[PDB]
Amino acid sequence: SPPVSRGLTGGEIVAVIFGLLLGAALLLGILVFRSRRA
Amino acid sequence: SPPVSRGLTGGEIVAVIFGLLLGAALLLGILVFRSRRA
Numbered sequence: 192s193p194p195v196s197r198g199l200t201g202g203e204i205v206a207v208i209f210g211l212l213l214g215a216a217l218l219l220g221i222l223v224f225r226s227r228r229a
Numbered sequence: 230s231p232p233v234s235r236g237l238t239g240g241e242i243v244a245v246i247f248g249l250l251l252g253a254a255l256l257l258g259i260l261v262f263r264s265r266r267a
Contacts, residue, residue: 198240202235203241203244204244206241206242206244206245206248207244207245207247207248208248209245210244210245210246210248210249210252211248211249211252212252214248214249214250214252214253215252215253215256215257218253219253219257
């Protein structure tokens with residue numbers, strides 16, 4: 192794959208951080224609600 | 230489809246899952262190793 196100029200743009204990294212934060216918070220949430228409640 | 234005339238590709242979603250899975254595993258890892266070690 193290319194470095195960060197060939198086919199990379201600022202409109203792509205936004206997806207990383209997005210799913211990163213929302214991924215942990217969401218995942219962790221369900222993981223706890225599963226059977227770790229209280 | 231995009232939010233407001235944008236245009237995505239299959240070479241963009243790879244970033245989401247990347248930081249998504251790697252984010253939870255990594256984050257959760259440090260979060261535990263922080264002071265939750267057993």
